[PDB]
Structure formats: C-alpha cells, structure tokens
Design a protein around this nucleic acid. Structure first.
Lengths: 206, 202
DNA sequence: TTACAAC
DNA sequence: TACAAC
C-alpha cells in the first residue's frame, strides 16, 4: 500500500508560482497540490488535485523579472486570489485527511528542484501561523534528482519527454499544470522502478 | 562514461558539520568532499576524498545544542581548522579539475537531505566571496529522495543498512553517503534500468 | 501536547 | 549570456 512504499510518508506533489526566488521576501502568487494513491497491484497514480491563486503577503516583494516570467499580474480583477492562510489551510486539511485514510504518519513534498517550493510553502505556512502543518520540515522527494537517476535528465521538460510524456516546452506552465506534469513524472519513475523489479526489495528474487 | 550519465553533471558527494541549522548565521565547522568515477563497464565508485576543519566565520552563531551533537570544539587550537576561503577554494579547485578531466560541464552536490549541505556551502562561498564556484546553484542529488525510491528508506543510517551497508564525523558520513549513492545508481543499471535502451538490447 | 532526522 | 525551481 501507499503507507508501505515510503515508510509511512504520504507523498504530495506541490508547485508554486512566485514573484522572486526569496521565500522570505518574495510573494507567493500561486500553489497547486496533487495527492497520490496506489492501486491494488501497487501502482502509483495521481489522486486528488487542489489549486489556488494567492494574494501577496503584506509588504511582500514583487520582482518584475519574475512577473515577466510567469505572466501573473497580482492585480488582475479576474484572478480571484485567496489569502495564504486560506489556501494552505485547505491544502493541509486535504493532506491530513489523505494521511489518515491511507494510514500514513506524515506528508512529504514531491517537487522539481523541491527546495524552492518547499521553502516558499514553509515560509507562507509560518507567516499565516498555520498549525498542524503535516509536511516534513526539511525532507523532500525532488524529481530533478529522481529523474537524473532514472532518466538521466534534471530539467523538468526534458525529463518528462524522455519518460514519454507530453510536454510543450514552448508553452508557459502555471502551477496547476506544472504540478500535474511533475506528478505524472514521479509516478512514472516509481512505477518503472517497480516494473523492472526494483520494488518490492524481494521482487528481484521472487 | 561518467559525463554521459547525468548530461555532463559532475557528481560530488559533500557533507558538512555545523553549529546550527541556519546557513546564514551559524558557523560552518567541517566539510568533506568525495568525487566519483566509472570504469569501462559503467559502474560508479568513489574517486578522491577531501576533508577540512573550518574556522567559524567572524561573529558566527554557535548553537550549544549543535556543538553537543557533533562534539566539535571550535576553540581547540589543535584542530587543523582553515578559513572558509581556504577549504572551499581547494575543494572547488579539485572539482574543476575533475570536471575538465572527465569532460563534464559543471558539478552537482550529492548529499543526504542535500539542501542543508548545499545552503551551507553556498553561504560560505558567498561569505568568502569565492568566484568560479563550479556547483549548480539550486539543483542537487538528494540521497534521501533517491533512497526513498530505491530502498524505501529516507533516514541515512536505515537506508545504508537496507542497502546492505554497515553503518555504525563528516568523513564517515560523506563516505557512507557516497557508497549509498553509488549502490543506488549501480543497482539501477544492474536491473537494466540504465542505459535507457538496455531494456531492448542483448 | 517528545524525541526523532540534514546540526 | 541565458539557462533552469520564479
């Protein structure tokens, strides 16, 4: 089961759009989260997906270079952004639920160059004084590393394509879609490892 | 071979001892580094080992709990401590040479919960005002994640034991971490996961 | 209503 | 340089 595969770690794929590279000073603008589930044969696949647009915390820094990269205007009338507390509380609630339903003991962030997203989410969590944050405070499942191992690629787009996934490099990917692509990649990597007899650790001798 | 494996990424195993968890405020006390190499068969293994004790930077923070944990006395005159500049300069110099020799284009840090060690090396490099840092600025190979995939374990000691390694100091940790990284990569190859075409070849 | 693990 | 986690 899911709770057996990673010693009780409930892997949650996360991706964020921001207005800079500094989690402490730069605005969190967007976040998406995908929970995973494992079927009866032990194959991993995407489960539940949430995504929010987030309002820049008070006094937050907005890098013009970053807004040019993601194309987000924090002042767009039609973006319907919620507070960091609103978004994270809902994400945390879903993840806790997933944790109990599957019999895990905590969540771990799955992300591409994971530290980035982990730093922003933890910084926003801390700002909104969210308690009962279910995520590991420093451990992550970074797909860039995992893809380097499995596919010999560290760049998201190329790793997906090498894995046989559809990835349009010419297109800008918002949190929602970057998260989904990352989640499929992670699943593929884990599943192929199992497919080839890497897991269970007795499979190669069965 | 080596530089074909990760698209020119030159994997270097690093482990640091520190006087706290904050990379910007807490002293770096110790660093070890281990380069890797492949044979003609394509099997990964440790190449060279570097080790330095580091003088706390001027005005650095020293968490008593951290010193209790790693048992380092930053004031012991008989620890062969060197400046952050000296240690990283030499490490960077060996890694640059390794990069050129093997035909890679840059280095990537291999470490357990790598962000910790990465943030401390970057902070020190910045402090020492080091130029020519050969390391990728935000990408790493985290053995905790890799071990999560390969061994279903994330804790270093548990992962090493699960891999069939004996696990009982930066030098020790770095060496264990290096061996663990190699076993993970080599097992992937053993099972025919690499190269990609291997699954459809004789 | 810890400690633990990257210190 | 730009690049890639923005």
């Amino acid at each position: 089961g899911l709770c057996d595969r990673f010693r009780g770690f409930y892997p949650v794929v996360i991706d964020v759009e921001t207005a800079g590279f500094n989690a402490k000073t730069d605005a969190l603008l967007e976040i998406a989260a995908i929970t995973l589930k494992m079927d009866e044969q032990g194959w991993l696949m995407p489960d539940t997906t949430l995504h929010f647009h987030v309002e820049p915390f008070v006094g937050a820094n907005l890098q013009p270079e970053a807004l040019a990269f993601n194309g987000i205007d924090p002042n767009d009338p039609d973006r319907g952004a919620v507070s960091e507390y609103e978004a994270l509380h809902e994400i945390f609630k879903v993840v806790r639920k997933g944790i109990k339903a599957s019999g895990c003991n905590r969540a771990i962030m799955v992300a591409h160059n994971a530290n980035f997203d982990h730093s922003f989410m933890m910084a926003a969590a801390e700002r909104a004084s969210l308690k009962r944050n279910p995520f590991h405070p420093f451990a992550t499942f970074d797909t860039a590393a995992l893809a380097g191992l499995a596919l010999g690629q560290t760049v998201l787009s190329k790793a997906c394509q090498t894995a046989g996934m559809d990835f349009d490099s010419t297109q800008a990917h918002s949190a929602l879609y970057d998260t989904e692509r990352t989640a499929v990649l992670f699943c593929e990597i884990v599943n192929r490892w199992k497919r080839l007899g890497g897991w269970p650790l007795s499979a190669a001798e069965e």
